[PDB]
């Protein structure tokens, strides 16, 4: 049946503190989608040479 | 709009349409349009006679213009004769565009 | 006097503007799937079941 | 409260309102038409009739009636049966004098122009395969077919060599011959009276009388069988019984409540289901079994419905046809006749609950009959069946010439003959 | 004409000077990267880029 | 003639009671001569764990089979015999039994459902044959694809949780699930400060309270097995499930950002939205005239079959989106053109698009409360998620207060940068990547 496919678990990737599954997505989107995106900030300011 | 001086103005019309010489090629006025947008939705609202009557009007003055030949004179179309077979048509689809224009402005 | 769906059985299809095309009363009439094995198979033209007729707002 | 204001107009139309304090307000036009008015040189001219509400006419266009509705977020709808057709229009209770204006165009002053008709043409495909896809869809309008020789036998669908050819003319013809003021009633479920008077006068001025005279339905004793890949068997047995409006009507409605004419538990076994528990004496496989009840004007039509396994379609119709032989000959209790008279007054009062429902069963009665009559009338006709008239009722099927109609594998059903 | 006139045309416009003037000052200040313009180049001093 | 403003004041409100049990009783008198009457209770599947996720759709199916004092067939005789009917459902967080009778079989109405939820039998060979009518029923839902690709969703937008499982559990469980597993289900959620005695129609509430005392005051009034469970959330995750078929003849996706829980202000500005976008279907009458513009391109160029939004609502969280079905050479141009309109709403939004917006809103949920069994699952469950009834005339005036700012803002905190869970159900190769997906929720000028 289509009532046994769930999915596999993939707490071996995620940002280190979203895996408590527990607390739910608003404090945790607040601070976590960013620093790598500052290293597209620095890929541009740099990109200018 | 004038009514005294419409005789006048009636004969400036029929020098204009025999200086213009598309019935020297056998065409009524409406044959002659640029087909825009408009213009493509009326042609293909007409009803199947008097288009299957267009598309062999056409064809033949596209053949008399690669040989630089026009027809015999007793074979030109005649002022008076001049169906505006389009003009129906085409009123109707300029009407309904500026209703989709009004309504999307209010 | 009493109507085509007061007696139940005849046929009626509906048209809409922004609803769906429907068609009778009693048509999936009931323990018919209920005892098993009824499937209900997939379209390549139709209408959704909901006909939106039914959402609180 | 206000029960109805009820009024004939001097040229025929009915015109009925009730004056609630609802929020929405319901408008229909109910009209004597339907695929039974039709011949064999315009079949399907009803169909696309049907599908045709929202094309330009002479006081609005296609654009302006889908764009002007939609703006206040009303609806428009189109009901057909075999005998009539209703056109609904519902927002809420402001807006309501602004969609009566385009209902009255829809069904006064239509236009019907070539290159509109002509792009319409292929919906009559998709609505008819949507349709198509319950398999009691096509077993039902063979039924008709079978049944009858003229009128009620066409179909409420196009037939398939008739798609492309429904022209304009055609469907002038049909609407000036048919929406005419005496077929017609006016019925308002949240406006005042004397304002839908006020509208009855804007087409008042043309169609005024009796349209043209349908013929009479001959009764043709027939069957017809199609052979197909479906995984189940559906079948249909039926005679002639009884039209709307008579004492022995009321008869058959109470039969068909003995028998069985659907379930009131979800997942129950129908305990008191006659039809049922025969059936479920000897076939252990899944089925299903109901009686069929059909009335119209001048006729109608009664009998068993059966879903099956193909290998054991023939146990099951016998099964179920001995059930109604026994009742024939006088096997019928007094506290079962009391538990069908109480199945049948309570559906009667839930489908009346609903606007929709409350606006379709005023409607059928000012086409039919020319009057309003309470639920409490209602209610004293189907206590005055007697069981003696139960009993008559199931021998004018037993003793009648019978039609058939079946679909799936039909290697082990019987013929009707048989 | 009045096929683009209407309170819907400059609606838009509205939205998008903003859109509108980052259009224009990003190119305006694109130009001075370009082709060394050398009255704009100290417009702010803090750019010494030839040498 | 009155006014829609004056039709508000005149609807009659709702009377609620409560008992010394922490039973609640509600109702609303409208003058008919039928009702509708019924029990809901918070539970369902989100309250249960691995070991007996079937266990609650395990119950509704032996409700109606047989009591201590109405053994078997001898309630479906009684119910018959009235001219009543008896209906249940069972969603992710609630369940409902109700019955329609006439307004004089009340008081047997009443004792029916009061035997039902509390002296229900269970007794072990009505579940052995029961277990093999759901193992049916798991293969028929299998083949309504819209069923199969809304599950699908749910399991991907909250992987972890137990919002993910589904109501019906897998097919395992159902060929495990014990007597003393559903035994232990009954005590533990079957309680009643957690149960709601709702009815409508005509019916007094004095008499329906008088009803309930009698019939209802024998459950235990307290928490006793000191169960107070800590309701604790559930997280979204941006994902994809992708189920490759090429025999199946058209294609289901389903898109869907985090949404709103139930008592959030945010809900009544984010339906407005949906109802720009709107919906349609092939046999719809009035395409390419259509005010929607997903709709009038979809039926000028054949695009689809039909497409629905939805705005589905849980406690803390929930799911807003779409869905669609369309042939194999359709689907990137479907997710192109529908992401164009989510953009276009978190800026430019206009507001004659907001009257309109306004104006469906207003329709849907006068229309929603026509009869005695939607106005009675309206009261029963806006007692388990908002504590009270909201009444017609404050629902208007939260919708007065929507202009196209208000929209314009809401729409941007919730759309705008933000990772989708997506579903898809075969033939599927032209949905586009992941990645194409997510750089579509930016945008190019603004």
């Known amino acids: 049946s289509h009532t046994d496919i769930r999915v596999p678990d993939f707490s071996d990737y995620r940002r280190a503190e979203v895996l408590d599954s527990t607390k739910s997505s608003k404090e945790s989107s607040d601070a976590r989608k960013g620093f790598s995106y500052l290293i597209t900030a620095t890929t541009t300011v740099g990109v200018a040479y | 709009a004038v009514a005294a001086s419409s005789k006048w103005l009636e004969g400036i019309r029929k020098w204009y349409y025999n200086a213009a010489g598309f019935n020297k090629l056998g065409l009524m006025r409406d044959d002659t349009i640029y087909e825009d947008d408009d213009v493509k939705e009326a042609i293909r609202r007409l009803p199947e006679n008097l288009y299957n009557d267009r598309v062999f009007r056409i064809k033949r003055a596209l053949d008399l213009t690669m040989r630089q030949q026009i027809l015999p004179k007793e074979q030109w179309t005649k002022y008076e004769e001049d169906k505006f077979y389009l003009e129906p048509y085409l009123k109707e689809v300029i009407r309904e565009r500026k209703e989709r224009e009004e309504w999307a402005k209010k | 006097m009493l109507s085509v769906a007061s007696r139940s059985g005849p046929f009626a299809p509906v048209l809409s503007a922004t609803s769906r095309g429907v068609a009778g009363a009693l048509r999936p009439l009931v323990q018919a799937a209920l005892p098993a094995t009824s499937e209900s198979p997939v379209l390549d033209a139709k209408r959704s079941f909901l006909c939106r007729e039914s959402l609180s707002g | 409260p206000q029960d109805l204001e009820f009024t004939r107009l001097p040229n025929g139309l009915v015109i009925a309102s009730l004056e609630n304090y609802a929020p929405a307000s319901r408008i229909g036009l109910f009209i004597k038409a339907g695929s039974r008015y039709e011949d064999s040189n315009n079949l399907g001219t009803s169909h696309l009739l049907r599908l045709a509400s929202s094309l330009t006419t002479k006081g609005a266009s296609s654009f302006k009636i889908t764009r002007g509705i939609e703006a206040v977020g009303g609806k428009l ?28 165009n829809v069904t006064a002053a239509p236009e019907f122009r070539r290159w509109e008709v002509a792009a319409l043409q292929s919906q009559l495909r998709i609505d008819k395969a949507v349709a198509f896809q319950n398999p009691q869809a096509q077993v039902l309008e063979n039924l008709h077919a079978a049944a009858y020789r003229n009128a009620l036998a066409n179909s409420l669908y196009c037939p398939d060599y008739r798609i492309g050819k429904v022209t304009p003319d055609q469907l002038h013809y049909y609407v000036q011959n048919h929406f005419t003021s005496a077929r017609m009633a006016l019925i308002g479920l949240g406006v005042s009276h004397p304002v839908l008077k006020q509208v009855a006068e804007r087409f008042l001025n043309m169609r005024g009388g009796l349209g043209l005279s349908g013929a009479k339905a001959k009764y043709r004793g027939g069957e017809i069988r199609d052979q197909n890949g479906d995984s189940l068997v559906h079948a249909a047995l039926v005679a002639e019984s009884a039209a709307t409006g008579s004492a022995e009507a009321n008869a058959f409605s109470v039969l068909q409540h003995v028998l069985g004419a659907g379930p009131h538990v979800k997942r129950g076994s129908n305990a008191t289901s006659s039809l049922y528990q025969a059936v479920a004496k000897g076939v252990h496989q899944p089925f299903d079994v109901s009686a069929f009840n059909a009335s119209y004007s001048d006729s109608g039509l009664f009998g068993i419905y059966t879903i099956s396994q193909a290998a054991s379609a023939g146990d099951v119709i016998k099964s179920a046809y001995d059930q109604v032989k026994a009742i024939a000959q006088g096997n019928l209790s007094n506290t079962d006749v009391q538990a069908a008279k109480n199945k049948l007054k309570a559906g009667y009062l839930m ?37 003696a008239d139960v009993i008559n009722a199931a021998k004018k099927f037993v003793s009648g010439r019978k039609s058939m109609a079946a679909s799936g594998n039909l290697g082990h059903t019987p013929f009707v003959d048989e | 004409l ?50 | 003639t009155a006014t829609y403003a004056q039709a508000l004041q005149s609807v009659p409100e709702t009377q609620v009671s409560q008992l010394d049990n922490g039973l609640r009783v509600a109702s609303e008198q409208s003058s008919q001569p039928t009702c509708t009457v019924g029990v809901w209770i918070d539970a369902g599947s989100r309250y249960e764990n691995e070991k007996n996720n079937g266990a609650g759709y395990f119950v509704e199916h032996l409700a109606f089979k047989g009591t201590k004092n109405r053994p078997g067939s001898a309630l479906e005789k009684e119910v018959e015999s009235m001219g009543a009917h008896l209906n249940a459902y069972s969603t992710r967080e609630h369940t409902a039994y109700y019955i329609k009778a006439l307004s004089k079989d009340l008081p047997k109405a009443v004792e029916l459902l009061a035997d039902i939820v509390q002296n229900c039998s269970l007794e072990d060979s009505q579940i052995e044959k029961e277990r093999d009518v759901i193992l049916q029923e798991l293969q028929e839902n299998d083949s309504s694809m819209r069923d199969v690709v809304f599950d699908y969703l749910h399991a991907t937008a909250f992987q972890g949780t137990p919002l993910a499982q589904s109501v019906e559990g897998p097919s395992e469980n159902v060929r495990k699930l014990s007597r003393a597993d559903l035994t232990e289900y009954v005590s533990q959620h079957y309680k009643a400060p957690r149960m709601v005695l709702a009815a409508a129609g005509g019916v007094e509430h004095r008499q329906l309270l008088d009803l309930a005392q009698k019939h209802f005051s024998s459950l235990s009034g307290t928490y006793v097995e000191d169960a107070v469970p800590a309701f604790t959330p559930c997280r979204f995750t941006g994902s994809e499930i992708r189920h490759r078929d090429d025999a199946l003849p058209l294609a289901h996706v389903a898109i869907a950002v985090e949404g709103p829980g139930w008592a959030n202000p945010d809900n009544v500005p984010l339906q407005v939205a949906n109802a720009i976008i709107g919906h349609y279907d092939s046999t719809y009458g009035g395409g390419t005239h259509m005010s929607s513009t997903l709709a009038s391109v979809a039926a000028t160029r054949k695009l689809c079959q039909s497409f629905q939004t939805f705005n589905i609502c849980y406690a803390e969280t929930g799911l807003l989106g779409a869905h669609f079905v ?17 953009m276009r709403l978190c800026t430019s939004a206009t507001e004659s698009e907001v009257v309109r917006g306004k104006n469906i809103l207003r329709n849907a949920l006068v229309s929603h409360l026509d009869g005695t069994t939607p106005v009675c699952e309206d009261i029963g469950r806006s007692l388990l998620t908002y504590g009270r009834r909201i009444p017609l005339a404050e629902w208007e005036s939260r919708i007065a207060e929507v202009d196209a700012s208000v929209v314009r803002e809401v729409c941007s905190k919730y759309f705008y940068d933000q990772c989708p869970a997506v579903a898809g159900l075969g033939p599927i190769e032209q949905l586009p990547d992941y990645n194409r997906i997510r750089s579509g929720m930016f945008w190019l000028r603004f």
């Open chain 4, 77 to 104: 709808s189109v009901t057909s049966t075999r005998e009539s057709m209703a056109y609904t229009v519902e927002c809420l209770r402001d807006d309501i004098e602004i969609l009566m204006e385009f209902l009255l």
């Open chain 6, 326 to 342: 369309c042939d194999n050479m359709s689907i990137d141009d479907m997710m192109f053109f529908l992401q164009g309109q989510w």
């Open chain 5, 2 to 51: 009045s096929r683009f006139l209407g309170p819907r045309y400059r609606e838009l416009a509205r939205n998008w000077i903003p859109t509108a003037s980052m259009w224009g000052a990003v190119g305006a200040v694109g130009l001075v990267w370009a082709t060394d313009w050398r009255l704009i180049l100290d417009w702010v001093p803090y750019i010494n880029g030839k040498f």
């Open chain 4, 351 to 387: 489908s009346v609950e609903s606007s929709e429902g409350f606006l379709d069963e005023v409607g059928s009665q000012a086409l039919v009959a020319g009057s309003y009559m309470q639920p409490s009338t209602v209610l004293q006709q189907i206590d005055s069946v007697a069981d």
